[PDB]
Structure 1
Amino acid sequence: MKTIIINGVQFNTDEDTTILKFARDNNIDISALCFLNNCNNDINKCEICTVEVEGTGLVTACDTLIEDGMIINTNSDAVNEKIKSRISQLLDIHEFKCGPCNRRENCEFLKLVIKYKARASKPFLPKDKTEYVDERSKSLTVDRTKCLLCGRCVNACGKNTETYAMKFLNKNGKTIIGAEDEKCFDDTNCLLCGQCIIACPVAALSEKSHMDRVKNALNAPEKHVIVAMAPSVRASIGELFNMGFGVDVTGKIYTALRQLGFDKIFDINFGADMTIMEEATELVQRIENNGPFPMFTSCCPGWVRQAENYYPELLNNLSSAKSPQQIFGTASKTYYPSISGLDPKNVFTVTVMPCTSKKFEADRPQMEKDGLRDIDAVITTRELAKMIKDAKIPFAKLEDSEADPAMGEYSGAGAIFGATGGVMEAALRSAKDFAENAELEDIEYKQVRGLNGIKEAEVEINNNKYNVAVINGASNLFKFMKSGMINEKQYHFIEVMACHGGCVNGGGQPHVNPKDLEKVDIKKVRASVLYNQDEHLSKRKSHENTALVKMYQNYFGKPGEGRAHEILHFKYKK
């Protein structure tokens, strides 16, 4: 073993790890900042994790290994003044205005300033933030007046996407972070997945705001404003109201959306069932025509952009079915009027997503028809949360209400969409019933679930074996293709999500403090909410959605053909 003295307390351990990690595992407080995802800022260590080691001096605990004979002190005056100096220096480059800041209620930096009572040697107060702000992107926004240059976004992008779209840049001899050549992120190989935002300890990286689109549309007398949340929203937004993790708040969201003044409360899970109708039918179609295999999902715009930027040869292999968001939006301007009498142009369709990329998908030029946008606005989970708080809605104390069932009902299949393997399973539940023309009892495909990067399974459909795969994260898509796993066998249907764990870990999701990520498996705790809804729902198949069946019977007809194929589909091409 090793003998380690920390603050006078002796430890006898055989572990090989860092001071920070060992300290955290023994309830010994050590501050940190730039350390996240088992990596720190190598070229510019923040030194917030400084601790004293007798015979060595001050050392960074987040990358310093424990060694026998170490006598560590974490709270000496020499350590605190050092940490206080670094935080003070960061403040010299930080616009310290927490009042209007969108991270006011969960900023790692603010908590560090309060903790050490640090103050700026000179308050950073830029007159014009123009040069510091980049709002060119449809999904991302950079405010470099808040940027600590901790590199956590850069490292996050590398790990999650392996695109390294977020880079350190030298602008006029000044270190900043941004896209390649300081271009607009959209104009680069960036996936707009927002993982860089999630890793950001401050409000330096945020989503491109759409709240003005919403509030204007709401206050517009003639505008009929629809709202519909994604699957993952009802399993995460509760976190930003001190309700904890893994708490279902579906009913509370519906009520909150009515108090905010939305004219109609629908649900994207209804659109998730639609996507399954239009994707399960296509899978069966491609089987009969024998290809083109494999069929890739197309509901994740992060993946779409990844295909557009790295694998354009696969764009014709993507499912023509629109994403649950876009497919919902299409029906909102055509079907919903036909059952409400509303003038389509007065219909304003808003979605609540866990995703920053969804903003880019919704504003795609061709994502419309007859001048009518499928989706007019997308607000992240964080945006809706702020919208609720600004309205002074006591969310945690709201009583449950239901959505409007015309486009608000959803089966358990559409419910699990928010988790990696969700779309896959949901699609197989319908495709097997379609191909075999039956109503099979066994519908649970646990094989394609979980947090494994790459997941594969052999499924039987109409007395024939087919190979499916589920790519869990953009970095795993790169690995899947580069390593030649695609060519090792003939796959017939592949799911691809950009964010590891699925949309429950989207870029528009609530920020989780590093100390909570250690205590909670955010990806599984969030997904559990979705699977629990699937288990307790009467309808667990997309095509068993009564409200949707009505819609298809009375308006669209059959899926994968006629009117359905006409307007609910969207093909990508190189």
Structure 2
Amino acid sequence: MKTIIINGVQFNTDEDTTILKFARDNNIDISALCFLNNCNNDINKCEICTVEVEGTGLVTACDTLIEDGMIINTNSDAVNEKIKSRISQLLDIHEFKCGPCNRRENCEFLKLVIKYKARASKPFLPKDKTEYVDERSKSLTVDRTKCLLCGRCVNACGKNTETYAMKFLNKNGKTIIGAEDEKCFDDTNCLLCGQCIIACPVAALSEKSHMDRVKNALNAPEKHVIVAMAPSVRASIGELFNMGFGVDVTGKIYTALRQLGFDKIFDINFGADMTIMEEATELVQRIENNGPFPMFTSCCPGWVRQAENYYPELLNNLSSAKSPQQIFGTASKTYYPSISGLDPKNVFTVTVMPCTSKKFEADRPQMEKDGLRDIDAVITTRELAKMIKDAKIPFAKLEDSEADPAMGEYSGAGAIFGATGGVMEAALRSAKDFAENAELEDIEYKQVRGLNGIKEAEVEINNNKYNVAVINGASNLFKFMKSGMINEKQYHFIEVMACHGGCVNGGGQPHVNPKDLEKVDIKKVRASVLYNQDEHLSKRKSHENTALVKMYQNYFGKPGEGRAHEILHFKYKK
């Protein structure tokens, strides 16, 4: 047993771990900043975690392992001086702009300003922010005035995607972060997933705003503005209203959206039942001899870009069905003008996503028909959260309401989409039903569920064995392919998500604060909201959705054929 005494207080312990980790578990207050995702900034560390080890001196706690017979000083004198020295070097390449900063209510640096009574030697006040600002991307923006180059985005991009698209760059003898050759992220191998935003402690990395598009549509007299939220939104935005974690707020969001002035309150889970409608039929048609195989999902835009950039040979194997966002959006300007005698031209479609990559997808040139965009705007979870807050609508005290039915109803299959293995379980519910022409009772595919990186399963369809895999996160796609696991058998259907945990851990999601990030399993608790909705739902198959069935009978006519084949699909060729 190792005996350590941190600040006159004794602890006996056997675990070999760092001083920050042990002082995190036993509620002691060592402050950290560049440490995240099991790694600090290896090249020029921040030292906000400096402690004193007797005889040795001031060391960085985030990577100094505990030894038997230590005496450690954290709230010390010499230690607190070295940390404020570091804080008044970073708060010197930053501006006190907390209102109107998008990060003031949950910053991390602002917390450590008032904690240490951190003062700037000279206030950093650039006359022109243009050199620091990058708004060229459809998904990501950078404001280097706020960057305290901790390296967390570079590390998170390396651990989560292994693309290393977020790099440390040298610009005129100085170090900045950005894409390769300081290009716009969109023009590099970046998947636009937004995990770098999720690891950023400040306002430096942010999503490209689409809420000026939204407010102008709401104020435009002729425009009939439709909104629809992604599966993961109802499972997470309540964190931004101090409601906690794993809180189902579906009904409160529908009310809130009506108080913001939206004309129709629909839901992307209806579009998720549409995507399974097309994709499960295509899978049954591919099983009719070859297809080819494997069929891959095409609903994660982060993954589509990974395929386009690293595996262009797989772009043909990708499912023709549009993503829920895009397929809902195509129906927004065609089926929804049919009922409600409106001109397609005057309908404006807004989606609320846990994703930054969705903004690139919606803005793709060919995601339109006859000049009308499938989706006109995509605000993230965080952006809808600010809309609600600016309007002072009291989210947590709100009464529940339902969505307008025609394009707002959803089944349990569409509900679990926001979690990893969600699209796989939903597709297999309709694919085994279609191929066997039966209403099967056994619908749970628990073996493709969960937080494992690579999950496989053998499903039986028409007394024949098929192999399916679920790739949880873009780094694991690289592992899948490069290791040759892809060749250990003939795979028939493969789900790929770019974010680990699925869309519930997407790039446009609420930031967590590392104290709560150590105690809460975010991916598990956000996803449990979705699965619990599936369990209590009476319809748990996409083709059983009553509103979906009559769109297809009165307007598209049969999945994967004629009208449904011509406008509800998209194939990538580069």
TM-score by length of 2: 1.00
Which whole-Å deviations, capped at 9, do the CAs of 1:70-118 have from their partners, x for residues lacking one? 1101111111111111111101101221010000100000001110001
Which whole-Å deviations, capped at 9, do the CAs of 1:441-499 have from their partners, x for residues lacking one? 00010000000000000000111000000000000000000000001110000000000
Matched residue of 2:105: which SS?
coil
Q: What is aligned with 2:98?
A: 98
1:23 & 1:486 partners in 2: Cα distance? Answer: 43
Which whole-Å deviations, capped at 9, do the CAs of 1:487-527 have from their partners, x for residues lacking one? 11100000000000000000000001111111100001000
2:42 & 2:540 partners in 1: Cα distance? Answer: 49
**Alpha-carbon shift at residue 27 of structure 1 (Å):** 1.0
Matched residue of 2:320: which SS?
coil
Q: What is aligned with 1:325?
A: 325
Identify the range of structure 1 (154-163 vs 73-82) with the bigger mean alpha-carbon deviation.
Answer: 73-82
Which whole-Å deviations, capped at 9, do the CAs of 1:194-243 have from their partners, x for residues lacking one? 00000000000000000000000000000000000000000000000100
2:551 & 2:25 partners in 1: Cα distance? Answer: 55
Which whole-Å deviations, capped at 9, do the CAs of 1:545-574 have from their partners, x for residues lacking one? 000000000000000001000100001113
Which whole-Å deviations, capped at 9, do the CAs of 1:42-90 have from their partners, x for residues lacking one? 1111100011111111111000010111110111111111111111110
Which whole-Å deviations, capped at 9, do the CAs of 1:162-197 have from their partners, x for residues lacking one? 000000011011110000000000000000000000
Q: What is aligned with 2:115?
A: 115
2:513 & 2:283 partners in 1: Cα distance? Answer: 41
2:44 & 2:235 partners in 1: Cα distance? Answer: 37
Matched residue of 1:429: which SS?
helix
2:483 & 2:119 partners in 1: Cα distance? Answer: 51
**Alpha-carbon shift at residue 289 of structure 1 (Å):** 3.4
Matched residue of 2:175: which SS?
strand
1:313 & 1:568 partners in 2: Cα distance? Answer: 23
1:88 & 1:268 partners in 2: Cα distance? Answer: 46
2:15 & 2:411 partners in 1: Cα distance? Answer: 48
2:162 & 2:284 partners in 1: Cα distance? Answer: 34
Which whole-Å deviations, capped at 9, do the CAs of 1:247-270 have from their partners, x for residues lacking one? 000000000000000000000000
2:189 & 2:384 partners in 1: Cα distance? Answer: 28
**Alpha-carbon shift at residue 291 of structure 1 (Å):** 2.2
1:484 & 1:326 partners in 2: Cα distance? Answer: 32
Segments of 5+ residues of structure 1 without an aligned counterpart are none
1:501 & 1:148 partners in 2: Cα distance? Answer: 28
- After TM superposition, list the pairs within 5 Å mapping 1:473-484 onto structure 2: 473-484=473-484
- Return structure 1 stretches of 4+ with deviation > 3 angstroms: none
**Alpha-carbon shift at residue 399 of structure 1 (Å):** 0.3
Matched residue of 2:106: which SS?
coil
Matched residue of 1:129: which SS?
coil
- After TM superposition, list the pairs within 5 Å mapping 1:25-424 onto structure 2: 25-424=25-424
Matched residue of 1:325: which SS?
helix
1:291 & 1:224 partners in 2: Cα distance? Answer: 41
1:246 & 1:125 partners in 2: Cα distance? Answer: 41
Matched residue of 2:176: which SS?
strand
1:442 & 1:458 partners in 2: Cα distance? Answer: 15
2:367 & 2:462 partners in 1: Cα distance? Answer: 35
Which whole-Å deviations, capped at 9, do the CAs of 1:318-372 have from their partners, x for residues lacking one? 0000000000000000000001111000000000000000000000000000110
Identify the range of structure 1 (7-16 vs 251-260) with the bigger mean alpha-carbon deviation.
Answer: 7-16
Matched residue of 2:405: which SS?
coil
The alignment covers a number of residue pairs equal to 574
2:416 & 2:484 partners in 1: Cα distance? Answer: 29
Which whole-Å deviations, capped at 9, do the CAs of 1:115-136 have from their partners, x for residues lacking one? 0001100000111111100000
Identify the range of structure 1 (121-130 vs 5-14) with the bigger mean alpha-carbon deviation.
Answer: 5-14
Matched residue of 1:27: which SS?
coil
1:164 & 1:513 partners in 2: Cα distance? Answer: 24
Matched residue of 2:127: which SS?
coil
Matched residue of 2:492: which SS?
strand
**Alpha-carbon shift at residue 379 of structure 1 (Å):** 0.3
**Alpha-carbon shift at residue 143 of structure 1 (Å):** 0.3
**Alpha-carbon shift at residue 14 of structure 1 (Å):** 1.4
RMSD over aligned CA atoms reads 0.5
**Alpha-carbon shift at residue 26 of structure 1 (Å):** 1.0
2:552 & 2:190 partners in 1: Cα distance? Answer: 37
Segments of 5+ residues of structure 2 without an aligned counterpart are none
